[PDB]
Amino acid sequence: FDIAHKMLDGQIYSDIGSRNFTLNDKIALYFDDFDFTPLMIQENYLSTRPSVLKPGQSHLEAVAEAANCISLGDIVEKKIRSSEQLWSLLPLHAVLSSVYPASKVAGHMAGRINFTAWLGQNSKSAKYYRLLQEIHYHTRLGTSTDKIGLRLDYLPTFRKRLLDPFLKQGADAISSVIEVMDDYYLTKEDWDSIMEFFVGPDVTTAIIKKIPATVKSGFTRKYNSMTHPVAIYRT
Amino acid sequence: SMLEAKFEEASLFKRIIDGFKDCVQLVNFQCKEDGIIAQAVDDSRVLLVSLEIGVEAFQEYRCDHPVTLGMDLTSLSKILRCGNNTDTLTLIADNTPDSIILLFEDTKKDRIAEYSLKLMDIDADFLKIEELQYDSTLSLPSSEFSKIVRDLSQLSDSINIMITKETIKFVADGDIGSGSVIIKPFVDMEHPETSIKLEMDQPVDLTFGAKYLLDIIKGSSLSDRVGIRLSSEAPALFQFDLKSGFLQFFLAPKFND
Amino acid sequence: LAQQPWVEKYRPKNLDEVTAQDHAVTVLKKTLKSANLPHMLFYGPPGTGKTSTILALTKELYGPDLMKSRILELNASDERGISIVREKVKNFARLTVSKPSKHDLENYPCPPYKIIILDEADSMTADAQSALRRTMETYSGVTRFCLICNYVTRIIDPLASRCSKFRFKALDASNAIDRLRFISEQENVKCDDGVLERILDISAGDLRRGITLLQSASKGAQYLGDGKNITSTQVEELAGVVPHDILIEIVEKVKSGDFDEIKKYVNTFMKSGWSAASVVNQLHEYYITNDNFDTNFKNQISWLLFTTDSRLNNGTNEHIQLLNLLVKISQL
Amino acid sequence: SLWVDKYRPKSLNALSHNEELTNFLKSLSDQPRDLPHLLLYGPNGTGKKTRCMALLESIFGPGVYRLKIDVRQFVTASNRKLELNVVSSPYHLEITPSDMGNNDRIVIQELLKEVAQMEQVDFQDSKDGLAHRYKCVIINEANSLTKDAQAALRRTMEKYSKNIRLIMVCDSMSPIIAPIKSRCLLIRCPAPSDSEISTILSDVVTNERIQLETKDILKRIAQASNGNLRVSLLMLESMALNNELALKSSSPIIKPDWIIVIHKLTRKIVKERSVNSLIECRAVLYDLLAHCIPANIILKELTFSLLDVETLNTTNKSSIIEYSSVFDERLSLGNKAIFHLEGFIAKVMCCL
Amino acid sequence: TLSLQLPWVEKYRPQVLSDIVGNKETIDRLQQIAKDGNMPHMIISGMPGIGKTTSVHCLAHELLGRSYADGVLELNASDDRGIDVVRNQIKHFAQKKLHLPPGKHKIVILDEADSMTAGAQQALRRTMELYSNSTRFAFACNQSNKIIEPLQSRCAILRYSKLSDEDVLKRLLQIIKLEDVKYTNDGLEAIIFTAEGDMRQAINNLQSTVAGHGLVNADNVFKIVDSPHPLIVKKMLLASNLEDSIQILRTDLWKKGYSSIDIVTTSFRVTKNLAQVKESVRLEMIKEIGLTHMRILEGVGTYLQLASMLAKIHKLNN
Amino acid sequence: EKRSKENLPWVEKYRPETLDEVYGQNEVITTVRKFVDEGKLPHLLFYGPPGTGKTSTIVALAREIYGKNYSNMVLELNASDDRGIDVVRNQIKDFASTRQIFSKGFKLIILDEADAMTNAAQNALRRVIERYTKNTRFCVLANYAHKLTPALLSRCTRFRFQPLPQEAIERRIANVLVHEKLKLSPNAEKALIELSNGDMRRVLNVLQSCKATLDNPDEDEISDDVIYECCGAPRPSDLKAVLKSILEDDWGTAHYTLNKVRSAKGLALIDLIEGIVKILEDYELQNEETRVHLLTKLADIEYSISKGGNDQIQGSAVIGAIKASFENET
DNA sequence: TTTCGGGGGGGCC
DNA sequence: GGCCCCCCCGGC
Ligand SMILES: Nc1ncnc2c1ncn2[C@@H]1O[C@H](COP(=O)(O)OP(=O)(O)OP(O)(O)=S)[C@@H](O)[C@H]1O
Ligand SMILES: Nc1ncnc2c1ncn2[C@@H]1O[C@H](COP(=O)(O)OP(=O)(O)OP(O)(O)=S)[C@@H](O)[C@H]1O
Ligand SMILES: Nc1ncnc2c1ncn2[C@@H]1O[C@H](COP(=O)(O)OP(=O)(O)OP(O)(O)=S)[C@@H](O)[C@H]1O
Ligand SMILES: Nc1nc2c(ncn2[C@@H]2O[C@H](COP(=O)(O)OP(=O)(O)O)[C@@H](O)[C@H]2O)c(=O)[nH]1
Ligand SMILES: [Mg+2]
Ligand SMILES: [Mg+2]
Ligand SMILES: [Mg+2]
């Protein structure tokens, strides 16, 4: 947080400030925490009122230039963490990921400095990708597609076949739904995972909560009262 | 074959190799009509090992022309472990060989195990570093030397040997403290195997690394006595005599400063 | 044999079966008598006969039996880290050469050294390459190294300095027609005049691709059961070359200059599966070799095509790149 | 079972579009003993995997369709344990190494080399008990393989061709390196035409007994799929379910949620151009990426939706397509896709 | 022919604190501490070839007199200094009993303490405190930031400055007087110019001269010594025209044998610290230099790439 | 080795054995000879580009100091041997702190290719070097000076190995020709020196390939043509013709000329680009932007070529870039 | 978070 | 004593 506050300050980037706080000092400030400075800069470079705008330039144009340099720094980072271990490029990354964009949007923070949100989002993405892989390999035998094709095309129709019936015919849907699951070696956990993927106008959280408790209890009882096949043995 | 040398019991060669496998990596054998002489230098160029197995140690030994064999002691030990400790061992080689053949034969049954070890292009000379006139030459049981080395090495990583008139002193100066062991020549007619002999020309004082002495003492399992020859400006000689040959460790003393 | 692809079945068995690499095969043959083979670094584009050349050299040097005891071949499928380089390669290079038999010495030259072939060496890390520098020089009297690569820039400068360089030229209709004609004759493939030349031109330096295309055409002709000569139209169809009608339609749409029409046409075109590289190559051929355009237009289109090809070489989306290139050309 | 999978053809004679490709595959299967390595490339959802399975069924017996899933274990240099789900049949094997990301290389060095370097026991249709045939390995999403993973295939194909034959399937050939493309027979798989899609949908409807007011319905569904047959079948099933197994002239075309989200994002970008708008766009992008929506798909759909706006001029469209090309290249060379997507959106906002 | 002469760097290594040149205030403080005693825990920081190890050794020797061999425990990067070593050997040394003059204590010298791991530094914390009445610690490092904050809190900071030209000239003149070495003023000026405040390099070059050619003059020094290539890179990057920059790059760097990677790294470092150019221009130049550096790392390291980098830099600086 | 030295490659067959056989480094050789002739041997560092004679020089110096048995009196380590922190702390320390086994004298440690060593090992080497300087001397050899730590450089006396001069290369070629019974034309020698770029390894390899190329080396003379076919390099006439066509002909003529020139001998585009760059760097361009555009575009094309791509498109890009850049001349 | 390689420090044996 | 495993940096 302190690094982000200091590096997103317009004073140091002015002629006098640059004379006192030099570029070497900025690179050292980056190196103080080289694993979190780029993420903090990327997170907090859109929430400032700049004081370094060039004559005729707007805030949006400076933001775009900073984003372009952030993308270039991301490419350099990918090169550093590779099969070649090109750590000698760490200083260049310092200029491409943190220093240059801040110098382009340096000013006064317009709000509270926020912690980087990329780590939680990445963890969520990894969890959802693992769930998608589980569903894909639980339904590979009956489907002709990849995981991406399964997510983008198959899952909506599976929702129409699996969740809509419960909302229309009440408990009577259970049997039918079970059949569909049996046709694709699907389990209750897979059912929930599939229901947890949709976004936008097709979010099922509220609808699923609105389902009657008795209907869900009967569905669970029917599922646990039968014998189901297994797609993969000893997962 | 060009070279055929039979060991009655494979344990003999296994023990001889076991005496210096922990201090060198690559060995060079050079077989002649008068036995097998081998040399090995350590990675630090501080210790040299010279073995001179004679022809009297083999059931039969035949060698037409001198033959050189560069080998790695790790692979040799690995293969020798394969053979049992109750079988005859034939070393076989041909003209300018590309491999050395170890043949384990068990006369009890009709089982024959042949192992071919690929040789290495090790080109080096021996230089016969056996400086003519040393300054002091002592001989004492290997057990006492091993005990002294093991006791003193626990104090310091360096051990100093002083040879004075009728006095041999081993000194170690470590962190927790220091330790000195003094032994004077003595003879027992009842049991001469335990006697200590010293022939002295000029006083000697030489320092050595404890690791190298700890490696060297492993040869006590081959001989009941050890001969230590010391001379200033020359490496120290530690000789263990065998049934027909011997094993010599030449250890360079540390610089004084 | 009859159960093997033609590319492997017509792999040069000896150094006399290499078609258009005489500038290096000559010195390689001379080494068979001189017995002073230097460290070699083969580099060139795909399908020029580098692996075949080294394998044939090994055939002619040691023979079928002594080969396995004198050759150490490692490729990208094998782990070649710094530890592997410092242990396995070093140990093999330190060994004495295997003993030749009386037959081997009576028939084959049997040079007094072994060979280590690091195929696809461009996939090795810089540290692993540096680990080989002194190994190559110290044991040059018992071992020789052959580094085979496609991108010579990926080999560190010291290694390239230590190795004698051999460039394998691209194989075209002027220097590889004889081998393709021989393969067709042995396989009894009846083709119209200029079909083999068209195949070699489409291959663009890759004789393996040409042989595969010839095999595909032969299979099609055999399955057709008409006893008719293979034509260039079928060869182009099997090679994924865009028909000239589609190309003239594309250039006409570009000449129109309307963004929406160009976008619609590209959307329809992308549904046929044509590769963007072929489209770019054919557009370059059509534009650069046309007298209807001025010098400035060609100057700009050359750079535009170069940029598009470089971007496509990085595994980018073909639809977006093709649309961008066509729009930019239309605005020239 | 969905209609998309319940009516998939299982033989080369059951294919119903691109008859020229069917004839080419039949010619290839006529003498399969010398079949070279194959690389099938074309648009998504056209039927490439179906054609590969049909070719395998033509080469071997109908038994290629008895698939079983097994788990293979791998160990990295750091001792980390990895698992790969392999689909196998008595005649062929299937792998998707990209599932392990940068570790896919290990597969090409451990699994494939294990299959090709050893013979296989075949106690059916054989007298001695040893297979007298080559093993066919199918690599799916071959365009997703790392460059070193692809390089690991070269000598494997060039050395053990007598025992292993590879049929790779990809959507684009640009990611494939030149040596691999040179080592394979390239097969282009054109997308089905609108008439063929309409015929397939009509057959499906007749089999399922779905009432249709007019056949033009199936035409519109064909146009909305942009040549994707899988999407066409799934959309037909969804519309039939949402219209009580009866499609009328007024039945809307159902689009998936992510497309609607991307269209809303495009509308927002067009309407508002500021840094606050960019912050909300970042939020939407994070939401899209967290739900297994690939970044490249997002970029392509966003670019085309922006270019399909009836308010922008030619200059705006040219700038948008140029930025899309540049940032697609950036994505291909980068790791954090959110950075490149945000940069592209910011540039588009600036140009507009 | 097999006997070696002691280098002047070791033959004239200062043995008393009065012979250390530069950092007059700190040396005076050390001398007064030696005169009185009660040495505190200290950390001496600086850059290579300034006299940190010499200062610590001289202080310890003068403080402990004949008891140097029993009251000084010296450990450097060539010795094992892990957590176990700190927890056993150093602890035992600190707990050791030894008789010393009234105001003297045992000394634990840790040369190049920066390389020490965090665990060992943490373990040293309470050891430096429980036994401060008999043992004191003197760390010597190049980068003070590598020493953890708790350790810095317990010690006195002694940051050394680079030796000025006057001090280097004084010590060099003393050495010349002792060795009776013929010299010229320009030769000494060139030696100082190449030294860059490093006394070790100055003495080494002075020995190489005389040993190589004899009389010390600019000609011989520059015959054996090379002007620091960073200055050449700075001149290349500050040329008014592209022609001059390319001429410098070719004649002075490429034809002299300098590698492309070295040239690009030096250009990056020099551009970082060009206080006479605006920050934005420097950042653009650094972006271009980074592009060229990545290209060179990929394997394409050629004169053409460096020429293109210079052309782009001149494009920016216009 | 195996058999006589005639089975070795020329790069290894002609390796300098003494210090008077090293050419092109007169200053360094004289300085080191004077140092060894008076016992004033400091910690040496040899910084230089590939194939300049650093390893040969240090081995010759070791042979001069010790003799034929130098291999038994020095500790030589390189990138092929592990040189971690443990190695420095045990093996190097033991070697430096111990007397010679075979014969008296000081200890020499040659860390060849030290630029590959890690920072930790170099840092550990500092006090090892500084403490045993009384009886041990360290020699370091490097091609990249940025990998060496500042302290290690401070502790070493630097010697720069320049790219080999023209005169030294000619003298070595004369010796090789005399020993091999070969004849070389003056233009052949000119081409060999030009393509060598100051590396003797390239000279020896190309000369061996030229000898192999000749059908009857006994009385055949090596000409520039032999070099050009052996190396596959473009002829100067070809480069001049291509540049002339690019500069004063239309696009069709330039394309035809480039294609014909390249297909005559199967020349590579990269060599042509290097040749044209060398030719143009001697031109007197009126406008600086012309040179700027030429350099930038040709560097971009070279980088693109380094990763494959389409050869025809790359050649057309070269032609168009040259034409556009020269348009600025006016 | 994170793709090798090197070093340390502990746990089985 | 030796493997075997896990954790942690990497620019100047
Ligand atoms: N000079 C050639 N002469 C005859 N056939 C060739 C020649 N070059 C390539 N081929 C043919 O193409 C096939 C493959 O040749 P390769 O030796 O594998 O080419 P390559 O250059 O080593 O491949 P790369 O660079 O690793 S992609 C051979 O089996 C031959 O059938
Ligand atoms: N102030 C000085 N006065 C006289 N000689 C000096 C001085 N500083 C360094 N030297 C000389 O350079 C040699 C080495 O000095 P050192 O004390 O080793 O430098 P250092 O700063 O401790 O090295 P580092 O920081 O571990 S790289 C000394 O033996 C002296 O001969
Ligand atoms: N000055 C030279 N005089 C004669 N031959 C040389 C000279 N320099 C290099 N060579 C020749 O090139 C071969 C290799 O020389 P090296 O000593 O290995 O060069 P190097 O600079 O040490 O290589 P690097 O920097 O580790 S890539 C020698 O066998 C010589 O035949
Ligand atoms: N009736 C019919 N359906 C096909 C045909 N080819 C593909 N399909 C259908 O289209 C769906 C998608 O095909 P698929 O091979 O998985 O697409 P791809 O792998 O992305 O190329 C499949 O579920 C098939 O049912 C065909 O020739 N005839
Ligand atoms: Mg190959
Ligand atoms: Mg110091
Ligand atoms: Mg060298």
What DSSP letter does each residue of B17-82 carry, written as one string? HHTTTTT-SEEEEEEETTEEEEEEE-TTSSEEEEEEE-GGGSSEEEESS-EEEEEEHHHHHHHHHH
Ligand 2 contacts CB of residue E134 (under 6 A) = no
Q: How many residues does chain A have?
A: 235
The percent of chain D in helix, strand and coil, each rounded to the nearest 5, is: 55, 15, 30
Class level of CATH domain D3-188: alpha beta
CA distances from C139 to C92, F70, F104 (A): 10, 18, 29
Handedness of CA C250, C253, C258, C264 (dihedral sign): negative
Q: Does E308 touch chain F (CB under 8 A)?
A: yes
Residue in the block written with tokens 């990809």: D170
Between CA E165 and CA B252 the distance in angstroms is: 46
For C240, left (φ over 0), alpha (ψ -120 to 50), or beta? left
Query: Any idea where the domains of chain C sit in the sequence?
Result: 1-171, 172-241, 242-332
Which amino acid belongs to residue F65? I
In degrees, to the nearest 5, what angle opens at C-alpha E102 toward C-alphas E99 and E104?
75
A167 CA – H4 C1', rounded, Å: 57
Ligand 2 contacts CB of residue E171 (under 6 A) = yes
Cα dihedral E276, E278, E281, E286 in deg (nearest 10): 70
Residue F307 phi, psi dihedral angles, 5° rounding: -110, 20
Between CA D79 and CA C43 the distance in angstroms is: 36
Residue A48 phi, psi dihedral angles, 5° rounding: -135, 150
**A/E interface, count of CB pairs below 8 Å:** 46
Ligand 2 contacts CB of residue E57 (under 6 A) = no
Burial class (CB in 10 A: 0-12, 13-18, 19+), E279: buried
Please provide the DSSP assignment of B129-197 as one string.
---SS-SEEEEEEHHHHHHHHHHHHTT-SEEEEEEETTEEEEEEE-SS-EEEEEE--B--SS-GGG-BE
Token pair of C209 as six digits: 């691709």
Comparing CA positions, the residue from A158, A226, A231 lying closest to residue A196 is: A158
Q: How many residues does chain C have?
A: 332
Token pair of F304 as six digits: 């693109």
Contact of E25 with E159, CB cutoff 8 Å: no
Nearest CA in chain C to E300: C153
Between CA B39 and CA B49 the distance in angstroms is: 6
Best C161, C168, C301, C308 member to test F by mutation, with max F CBs in 10 Å, is: C161
**Quick one: which H or E segment has residue C22?**
helix C22-34
Between CA F32 and CA F42 the distance in angstroms is: 10
What Rg value do the Cα atoms of chain E yield, rounded?
24
Q: Quick one: which atom of ligand 3 is closest to the CA of C157?
A: 27
How many structural domains compose chain B?
1
Contact of B170 with B153, CB cutoff 8 Å: no
**Quick one: which H or E segment has residue C157?**
helix C157-162
Residue in the block written with tokens 């007397």: F99
Contact of B147 with B140, CB cutoff 8 Å: no
Ligand 1 contacts CB of residue C50 (under 6 A) = yes
Residue A168 CB contacts under 8 Å (≥ 6 apart), including other chains: none
Q: How far does D258 lie from chain A, in Å, by closest CA?
A: 7
Q: Quick one: which atom of ligand 2 is closest to the CA of F126?
A: 26
Closest protein CA to C1' of nucleotide G8, residue: E82
Chain centre to alpha carbon of residue B126: 15
Between CA A3 and CA A26 the distance in angstroms is: 10
**Quick one: which H or E segment has residue C269?**
helix C259-270
Between CA A80 and CA A89 the distance in angstroms is: 7
Which amino acid belongs to residue C78? D
Between CA E252 and CA D125 the distance in angstroms is: 77
Q: In what order do the strands lie in the sheet with B112-118?
A: B60-63, B3-7, B88-93, B99-105, B112-118
User: Which-ligand-closest: CA of D234?
Assistant: 4
Instruction: Find residues 183-212 of chain C whose CB sits inside 8 Å of chain F.
Output: 204-205
Which amino acid belongs to residue F206? V
Residue F223 CB contacts under 8 Å (≥ 6 apart), including other chains: F185, F187, F188
Q: In what order do the strands lie in the sheet with B167-173?
A: B178-183, B167-173, B158-164, B204-209
Token pair of C236 as six digits: 């182009």
Between CA F291 and CA F282 the distance in angstroms is: 11
Contact of C37 with C8, CB cutoff 8 Å: no
Ligand 1 contacts CB of residue C150 (under 6 A) = yes
Between CA A92 and CA E264 the distance in angstroms is: 12
Which of F55, F180, F199 for a ligand 3 pocket mutation test, highest count of atoms within 8 Å of Cβ? F55
Between CA E254 and CA C324 the distance in angstroms is: 41
Listed resolution, Å: 2.8
SS3 C35: coil
Which amino acid belongs to residue C261? E
**DSSP letter at C314?**
T
CA distances from D150 to B22, D144, D176, E278 (A): 45, 10, 8, 47
In degrees, to the nearest 5, what angle opens at C-alpha D248 toward C-alphas D242 and D251?
50
Residue C85 CB contacts under 8 Å (≥ 6 apart), including other chains: C128, C131, C132, C135, F80
Give me the CATH code for the D257-351 domain, please. 1.20.272.10
Nearest CA in chain F to E201: F154
Token pair of F120 as six digits: 């930790």
C96 CA – H1 C1', rounded, Å: 35
Token pair of A36 as six digits: 């979190």
Burial class (CB in 10 A: 0-12, 13-18, 19+), D271: exposed
C82 CA – H5 C1', rounded, Å: 21
SS3 F110: strand
Token pair of B249 as six digits: 């460790």
Please provide the DSSP assignment of chain E as one string.
---PPPPHHHHT---SGGG--S-HHHHHHHHHHHHH--PPPEEEE--SSSSHHHHHHHHHHHHHGGGHHHHEEEE-TTS--SHHHIIIIIHHHHH------TT--EEEEEETGGGS-HHHHHHHHHHHHHTTTTEEEEEEES-GGGS-HHHHHHSEEEEPPPPPHHHHHHHHHHHHHHHT--B-HHHHHHHHHHHTT-HHHHHHHHHHHHHSSSSB-HHHHHHHS---HHHHHHHHHT-SSHHHHHHHIIIIIITTT--HHHHHHHHHHHHHT-TTS-HHHHHHHHHHHHHHHHHHHHT---HHHHHHHHHHHHHH--
Which amino acid belongs to residue D117? Q
User: Which-ligand-closest: CA of E206?
Assistant: 2
Give residue numbers after which chain C breaks (C–N above 2.5 Å): none
Nucleotide whose C1' lies closest to the alpha carbon of residue F83 = G6
**DSSP letter at D47?**
S
Q: Does E93 touch chain B (CB under 8 A)?
A: yes
Ligand 4 contacts CB of residue D43 (under 6 A) = no
Please provide the DSSP assignment of A26-82 as one string.
HHHHHHHTTTTHHHHHHHHSSSEEES-PPTT--HHHHHHHHHHHHHHHHHHHHHHSS
Residue C64 CB contacts under 8 Å (≥ 6 apart), including other chains: none
Contact of F200 with F161, CB cutoff 8 Å: no
Q: How far does E187 lie from chain F, in Å, by closest CA?
A: 17
Token pair of D93 as six digits: 């094997």
Pairing between strand D246-247 and E156-159?
A: unpaired
Which amino acid belongs to residue F152? L
Comparing CA positions, the residue from C144, C158, C166, C137 lying closest to residue C34 is: C144
Residue D220 phi, psi dihedral angles, 5° rounding: -60, -45
CA distances from D22 to B47, C47, D42, D140, F240 (A): 76, 29, 15, 21, 54
Contact of F138 with F88, CB cutoff 8 Å: no
Asked if domains D194-247 and D257-351 share a fold, the reply is no
In F185-268, the DSSP E strands lie at 221-222
Please name every residue paired with E183 in a beta bridge, in sequence order, or none if there are none. E216
Task: Consult the annotation and say whether F13 binds a ligand.
Answer: yes
Comparing CA positions, the residue from B219, B220, B238 lying closest to residue B229 is: B238
Contact of B83 with B113, CB cutoff 8 Å: yes
Between CA E307 and CA A202 the distance in angstroms is: 57
Residue E135 CB contacts under 8 Å (≥ 6 apart), including other chains: E93, E94, E105, E106, E107, E108, E128
In degrees, to the nearest 5, what angle opens at C-alpha E136 toward C-alphas E132 and E142?
135
Q: How far apart are the first and last CA of chain D?
A: 47
Contacts 24+ apart (CB under 8 A), B81-85: B82/B113, B82/B115, B83/B10, B83/B113, B84/B10, B85/B9, B85/B10, B85/B11, B85/B14
E297–A88 C-beta distance less than 8 A: yes
Residue in the block written with tokens 């560092």: F45
Between CA D262 and CA D256 the distance in angstroms is: 10
Chain centre to alpha carbon of residue D63: 24
E304–F295 C-beta distance less than 8 A: yes
Work out if F2's Cβ lies within 7 angstroms of strand H. Answer: no
Which residue, by CA, sits nearest to atom 26 of ligand 3? Answer: F50
Token pair of C9 as six digits: 């079945």
**Can you count the helices (H) and strands (E) in chain C?**
18, 5
Closest protein CA to C1' of nucleotide G2, residue: A81
Instruction: Find residues 287-306 of chain E whose CB sits inside 8 Å of chain C.
Output: 298-301
Contact of B99 with B115, CB cutoff 8 Å: no
In degrees, to the nearest 5, what angle opens at C-alpha A53 toward C-alphas A52 and A55?
125
SS3 D106: helix
Class level of CATH domain D194-247: mainly alpha
Between CA D350 and CA D323 the distance in angstroms is: 11
Between CA C153 and CA B84 the distance in angstroms is: 55
Residue C37 CB contacts under 8 Å (≥ 6 apart), including other chains: C31, C61, C111, C113, C144, F9
CA distances from E16 to E156, F222, F248 (A): 21, 69, 78
In chain F, the DSSP E strands lie at 44-47, 74-77, 107-111, 136-142, 157-160, 183-184, 221-222
Task: Consult the annotation and say whether C11 binds a ligand.
Answer: yes
Comparing CA positions, the residue from C74, C149, C140, C147 lying closest to residue C111 is: C140
Between CA C211 and CA E225 the distance in angstroms is: 61
Token pair of C316 as six digits: 């980018």
Which residue, by CA, sits nearest to atom 18 of ligand 3? Answer: F55
Q: Does D48 touch chain A (CB under 8 A)?
A: no
Chain centre to alpha carbon of residue B189: 29
User: Which-ligand-closest: CA of D187?
Assistant: 4
Chain centre to alpha carbon of residue D90: 25
Token pair of E278 as six digits: 């605006």
